[PDB]
mmCIF file of N, CA, C and O in Angstrom:
data_model
loop_
_atom_site.group_PDB
_atom_site.id
_atom_site.type_symbol
_atom_site.label_atom_id
_atom_site.label_comp_id
_atom_site.label_asym_id
_atom_site.label_seq_id
_atom_site.Cartn_x
_atom_site.Cartn_y
_atom_site.Cartn_z
ATOM 1 N N UNK A 25 14.583 -19.921 27.033
ATOM 2 C CA UNK A 25 14.068 -20.057 26.004
ATOM 3 C C UNK A 25 14.311 -18.450 25.186
ATOM 4 O O UNK A 25 14.104 -18.616 23.624
ATOM 5 N N UNK A 26 14.829 -17.526 25.479
ATOM 6 C CA UNK A 26 15.165 -16.277 24.752
ATOM 7 C C UNK A 26 16.220 -16.621 24.353
ATOM 8 O O UNK A 26 16.436 -15.946 22.508
ATOM 9 N N UNK A 27 17.376 -17.536 24.762
ATOM 10 C CA UNK A 27 18.616 -17.898 23.792
ATOM 11 C C UNK A 27 17.972 -18.278 22.713
ATOM 12 O O UNK A 27 18.498 -18.453 21.640
ATOM 13 N N UNK A 28 17.052 -19.167 23.225
ATOM 14 C CA UNK A 28 16.500 -19.796 21.698
ATOM 15 C C UNK A 28 16.031 -19.184 20.639
ATOM 16 O O UNK A 28 15.813 -19.688 19.650
ATOM 17 N N UNK A 29 15.494 -18.482 20.957
ATOM 18 C CA UNK A 29 14.622 -17.106 20.002
ATOM 19 C C UNK A 29 15.521 -16.416 19.738
ATOM 20 O O UNK A 29 15.901 -16.561 18.312
ATOM 21 N N UNK A 30 16.703 -15.812 19.975
ATOM 22 C CA UNK A 30 18.255 -15.173 19.094
ATOM 23 C C UNK A 30 18.553 -16.185 18.610
ATOM 24 O O UNK A 30 19.273 -15.828 17.537
ATOM 25 N N UNK A 31 19.299 -17.518 18.932
ATOM 26 C CA UNK A 31 19.452 -18.144 18.062
ATOM 27 C C UNK A 31 19.044 -18.857 16.429
ATOM 28 O O UNK A 31 19.472 -18.660 15.858
ATOM 29 N N UNK A 32 17.334 -18.652 16.918
ATOM 30 C CA UNK A 32 16.803 -19.313 15.223
ATOM 31 C C UNK A 32 16.528 -17.899 14.767
ATOM 32 O O UNK A 32 16.529 -18.122 13.015
ATOM 33 N N UNK A 33 16.639 -16.748 15.419
ATOM 34 C CA UNK A 33 16.729 -15.223 14.987
ATOM 35 C C UNK A 33 18.538 -15.372 13.454
ATOM 36 O O UNK A 33 17.929 -15.105 12.661
ATOM 37 N N UNK A 34 19.238 -15.559 14.386
ATOM 38 C CA UNK A 34 20.652 -15.335 13.290
ATOM 39 C C UNK A 34 20.589 -16.867 12.452
ATOM 40 O O UNK A 34 21.134 -16.323 11.173
ATOM 41 N N UNK A 35 20.508 -17.540 12.783
ATOM 42 C CA UNK A 35 20.128 -19.187 11.560
ATOM 43 C C UNK A 35 19.642 -18.664 10.631
ATOM 44 O O UNK A 35 19.928 -18.699 9.673
ATOM 45 N N UNK A 36 18.181 -17.622 10.497
ATOM 46 C CA UNK A 36 17.451 -17.130 9.362
ATOM 47 C C UNK A 36 18.000 -16.496 8.481
ATOM 48 O O UNK A 36 18.809 -16.213 7.215
ATOM 49 N N UNK A 37 18.833 -15.500 9.005
ATOM 50 C CA UNK A 37 19.970 -13.966 8.428
ATOM 51 C C UNK A 37 21.154 -15.505 7.395
ATOM 52 O O UNK A 37 21.087 -14.805 5.892
ATOM 53 N N UNK A 38 21.238 -16.324 8.022
ATOM 54 C CA UNK A 38 22.258 -16.733 7.764
ATOM 55 C C UNK A 38 22.110 -17.533 6.690
ATOM 56 O O UNK A 38 22.944 -18.132 5.950
ATOM 57 N N UNK A 39 20.450 -18.404 6.610
ATOM 58 C CA UNK A 39 20.284 -19.186 5.714
ATOM 59 C C UNK A 39 19.552 -18.107 4.307
ATOM 60 O O UNK A 39 19.246 -18.739 3.360
ATOM 61 N N UNK A 40 19.475 -16.705 3.775
ATOM 62 C CA UNK A 40 19.276 -15.876 3.189
ATOM 63 C C UNK A 40 20.093 -15.994 2.057
ATOM 64 O O UNK A 40 20.143 -14.919 1.287
ATOM 65 N N UNK A 41 21.140 -16.638 2.391
ATOM 66 C CA UNK A 41 22.313 -16.258 1.430
ATOM 67 C C UNK A 41 22.045 -16.963 -0.040
ATOM 68 O O UNK A 41 20.974 -18.052 0.588
ATOM 69 N N UNK A 42 22.660 -16.806 -1.265
ATOM 70 C CA UNK A 42 21.876 -17.600 -2.680
ATOM 71 C C UNK A 42 22.783 -18.443 -3.001
ATOM 72 O O UNK A 42 24.493 -18.109 -2.767
ATOM 73 N N UNK A 43 22.388 -19.214 -3.476
ATOM 74 C CA UNK A 43 23.382 -20.156 -4.144
ATOM 75 C C UNK A 43 24.210 -19.876 -5.465
ATOM 76 O O UNK A 43 25.023 -19.948 -5.673
ATOM 77 N N UNK A 44 23.183 -19.994 -6.472
ATOM 78 C CA UNK A 44 23.498 -19.687 -7.583
ATOM 79 C C UNK A 44 21.987 -19.461 -8.620
ATOM 80 O O UNK A 44 21.029 -19.536 -7.804
ATOM 81 N N UNK A 45 22.338 -19.139 -9.853
ATOM 82 C CA UNK A 45 21.251 -19.239 -10.382
ATOM 83 C C UNK A 45 20.820 -19.934 -12.192
ATOM 84 O O UNK A 45 22.489 -20.960 -11.636
ATOM 85 N N UNK A 46 20.049 -19.775 -12.751
ATOM 86 C CA UNK A 46 19.649 -20.624 -13.770
ATOM 87 C C UNK A 46 18.970 -20.443 -14.845
ATOM 88 O O UNK A 46 17.958 -19.652 -14.454
ATOM 89 N N UNK A 47 19.502 -20.453 -16.028
ATOM 90 C CA UNK A 47 18.874 -19.637 -17.391
ATOM 91 C C UNK A 47 18.803 -20.673 -18.540
ATOM 92 O O UNK A 47 19.613 -21.436 -18.420
ATOM 93 N N UNK A 48 17.726 -20.663 -19.270
ATOM 94 C CA UNK A 48 17.910 -20.875 -20.466
ATOM 95 C C UNK A 48 18.902 -20.348 -22.027
ATOM 96 O O UNK A 48 18.109 -18.939 -21.953
ATOM 97 N N UNK A 49 20.184 -20.404 -22.549
ATOM 98 C CA UNK A 49 20.416 -19.450 -23.715
ATOM 99 C C UNK A 49 19.589 -20.108 -24.342
ATOM 100 O O UNK A 49 19.563 -21.543 -25.600
ATOM 101 N N UNK A 50 18.499 -19.178 -25.294
ATOM 102 C CA UNK A 50 17.870 -19.450 -26.384
ATOM 103 C C UNK A 50 18.134 -18.476 -27.599
ATOM 104 O O UNK A 50 16.976 -18.557 -28.720
ATOM 105 N N UNK A 51 18.171 -16.898 -27.023
ATOM 106 C CA UNK A 51 18.265 -15.706 -28.190
ATOM 107 C C UNK A 51 19.118 -16.400 -28.857
ATOM 108 O O UNK A 51 19.855 -16.651 -28.912
ATOM 109 N N UNK A 52 18.617 -15.936 -30.358
ATOM 110 C CA UNK A 52 19.159 -15.871 -31.569
ATOM 111 C C UNK A 52 19.172 -17.510 -32.405
ATOM 112 O O UNK A 52 19.749 -17.199 -33.812
ATOM 113 N N UNK A 53 18.252 -18.313 -31.817
ATOM 114 C CA UNK A 53 18.580 -19.794 -32.144
ATOM 115 C C UNK A 53 16.915 -20.126 -33.045
ATOM 116 O O UNK A 53 15.769 -19.153 -32.750
ATOM 117 N N UNK A 54 16.505 -20.193 -34.568
ATOM 118 C CA UNK A 54 15.333 -20.091 -35.429
ATOM 119 C C UNK A 54 15.729 -21.772 -35.453
ATOM 120 O O UNK A 54 16.265 -22.668 -35.672
ATOM 121 N N UNK A 55 14.119 -22.021 -35.877
ATOM 122 C CA UNK A 55 13.992 -23.423 -36.404
ATOM 123 C C UNK A 55 14.150 -23.081 -38.025
ATOM 124 O O UNK A 55 14.259 -22.433 -38.120
ATOM 125 N N UNK A 56 14.066 -24.631 -38.263
ATOM 126 C CA UNK A 56 14.152 -24.969 -40.186
ATOM 127 C C UNK A 56 13.043 -25.168 -40.590
ATOM 128 O O UNK A 56 12.473 -26.748 -40.145
ATOM 129 N N UNK A 57 12.634 -25.028 -41.365
ATOM 130 C CA UNK A 57 12.110 -25.272 -42.545
ATOM 131 C C UNK A 57 12.933 -26.178 -43.610
ATOM 132 O O UNK A 57 13.442 -25.865 -43.979
ATOM 133 N N UNK A 58 12.036 -27.380 -43.735
ATOM 134 C CA UNK A 58 12.464 -28.326 -45.004
ATOM 135 C C UNK A 58 11.810 -28.434 -46.212
ATOM 136 O O UNK A 58 10.367 -28.512 -46.141
ATOM 137 N N UNK A 59 12.200 -27.949 -47.528
ATOM 138 C CA UNK A 59 11.901 -27.699 -48.679
ATOM 139 C C UNK A 59 11.659 -29.316 -49.194
ATOM 140 O O UNK A 59 12.696 -29.488 -49.509
ATOM 141 N N UNK A 60 10.967 -29.494 -50.116
ATOM 142 C CA UNK A 60 10.832 -31.089 -51.017
ATOM 143 C C UNK A 60 11.387 -31.289 -51.947
ATOM 144 O O UNK A 60 12.155 -31.820 -52.520
ATOM 145 N N UNK A 61 10.808 -29.996 -52.935
ATOM 146 C CA UNK A 61 11.204 -29.549 -54.265
ATOM 147 C C UNK A 61 11.742 -28.632 -54.370
ATOM 148 O O UNK A 61 11.695 -27.452 -54.251
ATOM 149 N N UNK A 62 12.530 -29.079 -56.063
ATOM 150 C CA UNK A 62 13.804 -27.793 -55.988
ATOM 151 C C UNK A 62 12.871 -26.609 -57.165
ATOM 152 O O UNK A 62 12.032 -27.134 -57.981
ATOM 153 N N UNK A 63 13.263 -25.765 -57.353
ATOM 154 C CA UNK A 63 11.761 -24.685 -58.132
ATOM 155 C C UNK A 63 12.395 -24.471 -59.462
ATOM 156 O O UNK A 63 12.858 -23.146 -59.662
ATOM 157 N N UNK A 64 12.294 -25.537 -59.840
ATOM 158 C CA UNK A 64 12.550 -24.991 -61.581
ATOM 159 C C UNK A 64 11.521 -24.380 -62.467
ATOM 160 O O UNK A 64 10.568 -25.111 -61.801
ATOM 161 N N UNK A 65 11.537 -23.810 -63.453
ATOM 162 C CA UNK A 65 11.248 -22.316 -63.604
ATOM 163 C C UNK A 65 11.062 -23.149 -65.628
ATOM 164 O O UNK A 65 11.048 -21.967 -66.292
ATOM 165 N N UNK A 66 11.491 -23.988 -66.098
ATOM 166 C CA UNK A 66 11.935 -23.624 -67.450
ATOM 167 C C UNK A 66 10.283 -24.638 -67.481
ATOM 168 O O UNK A 66 9.245 -25.741 -67.484
ATOM 169 N N UNK A 67 9.790 -24.243 -69.194
ATOM 170 C CA UNK A 67 8.799 -25.150 -69.804
ATOM 171 C C UNK A 67 9.508 -25.157 -71.315
ATOM 172 O O UNK A 67 10.027 -24.522 -71.879
ATOM 173 N N UNK A 68 8.867 -26.052 -71.956
ATOM 174 C CA UNK A 68 9.274 -26.680 -73.595
ATOM 175 C C UNK A 68 7.911 -26.101 -73.828
ATOM 176 O O UNK A 68 7.186 -26.563 -73.917
ATOM 177 N N UNK A 69 8.398 -25.314 -75.347
ATOM 178 C CA UNK A 69 7.623 -25.030 -75.691
ATOM 179 C C UNK A 69 8.071 -25.642 -77.603
ATOM 180 O O UNK A 69 8.968 -25.151 -78.041
ATOM 181 N N UNK A 70 6.613 -26.693 -78.741
ATOM 182 C CA UNK A 70 7.215 -27.227 -79.630
ATOM 183 C C UNK A 70 5.934 -27.326 -80.071
ATOM 184 O O UNK A 70 4.795 -26.374 -80.380
ATOM 185 N N UNK A 71 5.973 -26.592 -81.607
ATOM 186 C CA UNK A 71 5.260 -26.471 -82.683
ATOM 187 C C UNK A 71 4.703 -27.623 -83.237
ATOM 188 O O UNK A 71 5.100 -28.973 -82.785
ATOM 189 N N UNK A 72 3.574 -27.556 -83.394
ATOM 190 C CA UNK A 72 2.779 -28.813 -83.658
ATOM 191 C C UNK A 72 3.475 -30.374 -84.996
ATOM 192 O O UNK A 72 3.324 -31.134 -84.377
ATOM 193 N N UNK A 73 3.819 -29.541 -86.192
ATOM 194 C CA UNK A 73 4.365 -30.218 -86.359
ATOM 195 C C UNK A 73 5.988 -30.773 -86.127
ATOM 196 O O UNK A 73 6.168 -31.572 -87.262
ATOM 197 N N UNK A 74 6.345 -29.987 -85.097
ATOM 198 C CA UNK A 74 7.919 -30.592 -84.914
ATOM 199 C C UNK A 74 9.062 -29.963 -84.983
ATOM 200 O O UNK A 74 10.360 -30.201 -84.713
ATOM 201 N N UNK A 75 8.531 -28.775 -86.288
ATOM 202 C CA UNK A 75 10.267 -28.298 -86.655
ATOM 203 C C UNK A 75 10.302 -28.034 -85.877
ATOM 204 O O UNK A 75 11.842 -27.356 -85.498
ATOM 205 N N UNK B 3 25.678 1.518 -0.011
ATOM 206 C CA UNK B 3 25.448 1.038 -1.700
ATOM 207 C C UNK B 3 23.864 0.756 -1.040
ATOM 208 O O UNK B 3 23.687 0.578 -0.417
ATOM 209 N N UNK B 4 23.592 -0.006 -2.517
ATOM 210 C CA UNK B 4 22.616 -0.020 -2.440
ATOM 211 C C UNK B 4 22.359 -1.739 -1.926
ATOM 212 O O UNK B 4 21.282 -2.298 -1.447
ATOM 213 N N UNK B 5 23.121 -2.329 -2.354
ATOM 214 C CA UNK B 5 23.183 -4.209 -2.178
ATOM 215 C C UNK B 5 23.051 -3.703 -0.541
ATOM 216 O O UNK B 5 22.445 -4.966 0.167
ATOM 217 N N UNK B 6 24.025 -2.986 -0.028
ATOM 218 C CA UNK B 6 24.217 -3.168 1.340
ATOM 219 C C UNK B 6 22.985 -2.710 1.570
ATOM 220 O O UNK B 6 22.327 -3.337 3.377
ATOM 221 N N UNK B 7 21.855 -1.811 1.549
ATOM 222 C CA UNK B 7 21.100 -1.322 2.149
ATOM 223 C C UNK B 7 19.751 -2.732 2.061
ATOM 224 O O UNK B 7 18.838 -2.467 2.850
ATOM 225 N N UNK B 8 19.354 -3.040 0.841
ATOM 226 C CA UNK B 8 18.218 -4.069 0.264
ATOM 227 C C UNK B 8 19.323 -5.787 0.883
ATOM 228 O O UNK B 8 17.603 -5.753 1.974
ATOM 229 N N UNK B 9 20.247 -5.539 1.395
ATOM 230 C CA UNK B 9 20.288 -6.790 2.318
ATOM 231 C C UNK B 9 20.048 -6.544 3.261
ATOM 232 O O UNK B 9 19.140 -7.394 4.534
ATOM 233 N N UNK B 10 20.437 -5.449 4.174
ATOM 234 C CA UNK B 10 20.391 -4.658 5.727
ATOM 235 C C UNK B 10 18.038 -4.955 5.300
ATOM 236 O O UNK B 10 17.719 -5.524 7.224
ATOM 237 N N UNK B 11 17.622 -4.122 4.952
ATOM 238 C CA UNK B 11 16.340 -4.302 4.718
ATOM 239 C C UNK B 11 15.838 -5.947 4.904
ATOM 240 O O UNK B 11 14.774 -6.090 5.202
ATOM 241 N N UNK B 12 15.882 -6.907 4.488
ATOM 242 C CA UNK B 12 15.258 -7.787 3.773
ATOM 243 C C UNK B 12 15.615 -9.147 4.680
ATOM 244 O O UNK B 12 14.779 -9.578 6.033
ATOM 245 N N UNK B 13 17.192 -8.480 6.026
ATOM 246 C CA UNK B 13 17.294 -9.651 6.789
ATOM 247 C C UNK B 13 16.497 -9.190 8.375
ATOM 248 O O UNK B 13 16.286 -9.726 9.044
ATOM 249 N N UNK B 14 16.749 -7.682 8.378
ATOM 250 C CA UNK B 14 15.558 -6.981 9.313
ATOM 251 C C UNK B 14 14.613 -7.517 9.316
ATOM 252 O O UNK B 14 14.034 -8.045 10.603
ATOM 253 N N UNK B 15 13.495 -7.201 8.280
ATOM 254 C CA UNK B 15 12.332 -7.927 8.335
ATOM 255 C C UNK B 15 12.301 -9.274 8.579
ATOM 256 O O UNK B 15 11.040 -10.006 9.485
ATOM 257 N N UNK B 16 13.080 -10.371 8.364
ATOM 258 C CA UNK B 16 13.077 -11.716 8.745
ATOM 259 C C UNK B 16 13.319 -11.912 9.963
ATOM 260 O O UNK B 16 13.251 -13.159 10.518
ATOM 261 N N UNK B 17 14.235 -10.930 10.543
ATOM 262 C CA UNK B 17 14.296 -11.089 12.111
ATOM 263 C C UNK B 17 13.349 -10.945 13.382
ATOM 264 O O UNK B 17 12.678 -11.941 13.648
ATOM 265 N N UNK B 18 12.351 -9.417 12.639
ATOM 266 C CA UNK B 18 11.484 -9.179 13.174
ATOM 267 C C UNK B 18 9.877 -10.099 13.068
ATOM 268 O O UNK B 18 9.657 -10.139 13.681
ATOM 269 N N UNK B 19 10.239 -10.920 12.060
ATOM 270 C CA UNK B 19 8.673 -11.605 11.938
ATOM 271 C C UNK B 19 9.021 -13.278 12.971
ATOM 272 O O UNK B 19 8.080 -13.508 13.220
ATOM 273 N N UNK B 20 10.604 -13.688 12.928
ATOM 274 C CA UNK B 20 10.490 -14.556 13.853
ATOM 275 C C UNK B 20 10.927 -13.959 14.902
ATOM 276 O O UNK B 20 10.074 -15.094 15.990
ATOM 277 N N UNK B 21 10.780 -13.513 15.159
ATOM 278 C CA UNK B 21 10.978 -12.897 16.785
ATOM 279 C C UNK B 21 9.741 -12.708 17.276
ATOM 280 O O UNK B 21 8.778 -13.383 19.073
ATOM 281 N N UNK B 22 8.864 -12.070 16.620
ATOM 282 C CA UNK B 22 7.116 -12.250 17.298
ATOM 283 C C UNK B 22 6.384 -13.101 16.953
ATOM 284 O O UNK B 22 4.866 -13.001 17.183
ATOM 285 N N UNK B 23 6.735 -14.513 16.154
ATOM 286 C CA UNK B 23 6.518 -15.514 15.577
ATOM 287 C C UNK B 23 6.071 -16.219 16.944
ATOM 288 O O UNK B 23 7.086 -16.315 18.536
ATOM 289 N N UNK B 24 5.050 -17.049 17.510
ATOM 290 C CA UNK B 24 5.040 -17.976 18.690
ATOM 291 C C UNK B 24 4.860 -17.268 19.324
ATOM 292 O O UNK B 24 4.052 -16.296 19.632
ATOM 293 N N UNK B 25 5.765 -17.706 20.965
ATOM 294 C CA UNK B 25 5.479 -16.743 21.463
ATOM 295 C C UNK B 25 6.579 -15.246 21.653
ATOM 296 O O UNK B 25 7.754 -15.762 21.519
ATOM 297 N N UNK B 26 6.017 -14.181 21.432
ATOM 298 C CA UNK B 26 7.135 -13.491 21.498
ATOM 299 C C UNK B 26 8.352 -12.885 22.615
ATOM 300 O O UNK B 26 8.412 -13.142 23.296
ATOM 301 N N UNK B 27 9.252 -12.435 21.781
ATOM 302 C CA UNK B 27 10.436 -12.418 22.860
ATOM 303 C C UNK B 27 10.746 -11.070 23.842
ATOM 304 O O UNK B 27 11.262 -11.436 24.524
ATOM 305 N N UNK B 28 10.203 -10.292 23.271
ATOM 306 C CA UNK B 28 9.874 -9.102 23.959
ATOM 307 C C UNK B 28 8.467 -8.926 24.677
ATOM 308 O O UNK B 28 7.737 -9.275 24.415
ATOM 309 N N UNK B 29 8.587 -8.313 25.945
ATOM 310 C CA UNK B 29 7.807 -8.389 26.877
ATOM 311 C C UNK B 29 6.580 -7.142 25.989
ATOM 312 O O UNK B 29 6.349 -6.775 25.367
ATOM 313 N N UNK B 30 4.776 -7.693 27.393
ATOM 314 C CA UNK B 30 3.626 -6.982 26.533
ATOM 315 C C UNK B 30 4.273 -5.183 27.502
ATOM 316 O O UNK B 30 3.836 -4.254 26.686
ATOM 317 N N UNK B 31 5.186 -4.974 27.926
ATOM 318 C CA UNK B 31 5.072 -3.687 28.769
ATOM 319 C C UNK B 31 6.518 -2.695 27.963
ATOM 320 O O UNK B 31 6.208 -1.885 28.071
ATOM 321 N N UNK B 32 7.354 -3.495 27.137
ATOM 322 C CA UNK B 32 8.058 -2.577 25.758
ATOM 323 C C UNK B 32 7.098 -2.410 25.086
ATOM 324 O O UNK B 32 6.716 -1.669 24.148
ATOM 325 N N UNK B 33 6.289 -3.200 24.830
ATOM 326 C CA UNK B 33 5.419 -3.120 23.539
ATOM 327 C C UNK B 33 3.979 -1.865 23.968
ATOM 328 O O UNK B 33 3.984 -0.898 23.078
ATOM 329 N N UNK B 34 4.426 -1.747 24.892
ATOM 330 C CA UNK B 34 3.287 -0.749 25.421
ATOM 331 C C UNK B 34 3.985 0.550 25.101
ATOM 332 O O UNK B 34 3.274 1.489 24.949
ATOM 333 N N UNK B 35 5.127 0.897 25.193
ATOM 334 C CA UNK B 35 5.757 1.918 25.422
ATOM 335 C C UNK B 35 6.012 1.756 24.131
ATOM 336 O O UNK B 35 5.986 3.143 23.626
ATOM 337 N N UNK B 36 6.089 1.448 23.257
ATOM 338 C CA UNK B 36 6.624 1.633 21.715
ATOM 339 C C UNK B 36 5.167 1.511 20.776
ATOM 340 O O UNK B 36 5.737 2.778 19.866
ATOM 341 N N UNK B 37 4.071 1.473 21.561
ATOM 342 C CA UNK B 37 3.143 1.366 20.676
ATOM 343 C C UNK B 37 2.276 2.838 21.778
ATOM 344 O O UNK B 37 1.130 3.386 20.681
ATOM 345 N N UNK B 38 3.286 3.730 22.441
ATOM 346 C CA UNK B 38 2.127 4.668 23.040
ATOM 347 C C UNK B 38 1.826 5.783 21.570
ATOM 348 O O UNK B 38 0.776 6.912 22.112
ATOM 349 N N UNK B 39 2.675 6.105 20.553
ATOM 350 C CA UNK B 39 2.289 6.942 19.548
ATOM 351 C C UNK B 39 1.496 7.029 18.601
ATOM 352 O O UNK B 39 1.281 7.294 17.188
ATOM 353 N N UNK B 40 0.612 5.093 18.766
ATOM 354 C CA UNK B 40 -0.212 4.632 17.892
ATOM 355 C C UNK B 40 0.326 3.439 17.123
ATOM 356 O O UNK B 40 -0.335 3.633 16.238
ATOM 357 N N UNK B 41 2.052 3.538 16.761
ATOM 358 C CA UNK B 41 2.573 2.697 15.917
ATOM 359 C C UNK B 41 1.650 1.395 16.658
ATOM 360 O O UNK B 41 1.823 0.778 17.065
ATOM 361 N N UNK B 42 1.943 -0.244 15.346
ATOM 362 C CA UNK B 42 1.876 -1.439 15.551
ATOM 363 C C UNK B 42 3.140 -1.766 16.425
ATOM 364 O O UNK B 42 4.585 -1.358 16.355
ATOM 365 N N UNK B 43 2.815 -2.803 17.624
ATOM 366 C CA UNK B 43 4.082 -3.061 17.927
ATOM 367 C C UNK B 43 5.447 -4.057 17.240
ATOM 368 O O UNK B 43 6.449 -3.703 18.010
ATOM 369 N N UNK B 44 5.039 -4.359 16.015
ATOM 370 C CA UNK B 44 5.920 -4.687 14.801
ATOM 371 C C UNK B 44 6.834 -3.981 14.257
ATOM 372 O O UNK B 44 7.882 -3.430 14.186
ATOM 373 N N UNK B 45 5.816 -2.588 14.103
ATOM 374 C CA UNK B 45 6.732 -1.293 13.588
ATOM 375 C C UNK B 45 7.701 -1.073 14.794
ATOM 376 O O UNK B 45 8.805 -0.368 14.465
ATOM 377 N N UNK B 46 6.954 -1.087 15.723
ATOM 378 C CA UNK B 46 7.833 0.198 16.732
ATOM 379 C C UNK B 46 9.283 -0.920 17.561
ATOM 380 O O UNK B 46 10.181 0.055 17.092
ATOM 381 N N UNK B 47 9.075 -1.976 16.897
ATOM 382 C CA UNK B 47 10.223 -2.668 17.808
ATOM 383 C C UNK B 47 11.233 -2.694 16.479
ATOM 384 O O UNK B 47 12.652 -2.371 17.067
ATOM 385 N N UNK B 48 10.888 -2.755 14.732
ATOM 386 C CA UNK B 48 12.017 -2.861 13.906
ATOM 387 C C UNK B 48 12.719 -1.365 14.062
ATOM 388 O O UNK B 48 14.138 -1.611 13.989
ATOM 389 N N UNK B 49 11.995 -0.372 14.578
ATOM 390 C CA UNK B 49 12.827 1.168 14.731
ATOM 391 C C UNK B 49 13.738 0.887 16.042
ATOM 392 O O UNK B 49 14.759 1.483 15.529
ATOM 393 N N UNK B 50 12.955 0.271 16.699
ATOM 394 C CA UNK B 50 14.456 0.395 18.001
ATOM 395 C C UNK B 50 15.263 -0.589 17.749
ATOM 396 O O UNK B 50 16.545 0.086 17.779
ATOM 397 N N UNK B 51 14.997 -1.762 17.272
ATOM 398 C CA UNK B 51 16.137 -2.437 16.878
ATOM 399 C C UNK B 51 17.076 -1.770 15.600
ATOM 400 O O UNK B 51 18.436 -1.767 15.803
ATOM 401 N N UNK B 52 16.798 -0.831 14.972
ATOM 402 C CA UNK B 52 17.266 -0.439 13.951
ATOM 403 C C UNK B 52 18.479 0.551 14.259
ATOM 404 O O UNK B 52 19.889 0.671 13.939
#
């Protein structure tokens, strides 16, 4: 029974090793909006007689 | 090194938790000697193992 206690304690230490890590790479990334219409700024001004 | 100290501290706590779980590995006679100064049985054993 004492040996079973000792062996189990050593096994727990051996299981404390770390396998790897995982993370998400997202810094520097932004979302894009979509502009539907082209912003023209032209207006036509004409005289009443059409001259 | 910090890595060695951190590794030793965590492993020491894991062993102490396992030895005192269920029926303790060490007897009550040892715990009386280790607790004679007022410390807990778990604390006294952890220092002596160290």
